[PDB]
Design a protein around this motif. Sequence first.
Motif, short mmCIF file in Angstrom:
data_model
loop_
_atom_site.label_atom_id
_atom_site.label_comp_id
_atom_site.label_asym_id
_atom_site.label_seq_id
_atom_site.Cartn_x
_atom_site.Cartn_y
_atom_site.Cartn_z
N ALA A 1 37.38 41.77 -1.75
CA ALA A 1 37.24 40.63 -2.83
C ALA A 1 37.33 41.18 -4.16
O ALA A 1 37.56 40.66 -5.19
N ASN B 1 43.69 39.04 -6.49
CA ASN B 1 42.57 38.54 -6.05
C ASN B 1 43.08 37.25 -4.78
O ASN B 1 44.13 36.49 -5.24
N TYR B 2 42.35 37.17 -3.90
CA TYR B 2 42.72 36.20 -2.85
C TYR B 2 41.65 35.41 -2.43
O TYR B 2 40.62 35.53 -2.43
N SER B 3 42.10 34.04 -1.70
CA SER B 3 41.25 33.17 -1.19
C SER B 3 41.92 32.69 0.08
O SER B 3 43.11 32.56 0.30
N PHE B 4 41.02 32.21 1.25
CA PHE B 4 41.64 31.64 2.19
C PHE B 4 41.33 30.05 2.44
O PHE B 4 40.22 29.38 1.91
N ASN B 5 42.57 29.42 2.50
CA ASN B 5 42.53 27.93 2.49
C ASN B 5 42.80 27.41 3.91
O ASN B 5 43.81 27.81 4.66
N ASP B 6 41.72 26.83 4.55
CA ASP B 6 41.81 26.27 6.02
C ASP B 6 42.86 25.42 5.88
O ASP B 6 43.40 24.97 7.08
#
Length: 123
Positions: free
Chosen positions: A31, A43-48
């Motif tokens: 993070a 920076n990254y995020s997860f999209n279901d």
Amino acid sequence: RSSLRIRLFNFSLKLLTCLLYIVRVLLDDPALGIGCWGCPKQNYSFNDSSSEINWAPILWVERKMTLWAIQVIVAIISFLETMLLIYLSYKGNIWEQIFRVSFVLEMINTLPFIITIFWPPLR
């Protein structure tokens, strides 16, 4: 019994580098930022919902300056000793060493640390 000492040292080396991998993953926080070794950490995020998965987190793991070098050193010694044993003992067969399934795991898990020395961006 010097040969048994060599294998005992190698067994210690393999368990030591696996534990150093644990030390890495314990001190690696994604993070904060994940990138390719210096500039552009992103920076990254997860999209279901979106089915596509970003491979940069999987492809890239942040490694400390001390940690990358000590793992390279440990990998080289383990690389040296295994081929020390391979060149020490032929016993009438030069082939068939890679088909027995211990050479592939040794080589695929070790020389990547050797090739990371050439490219600073791949550390």
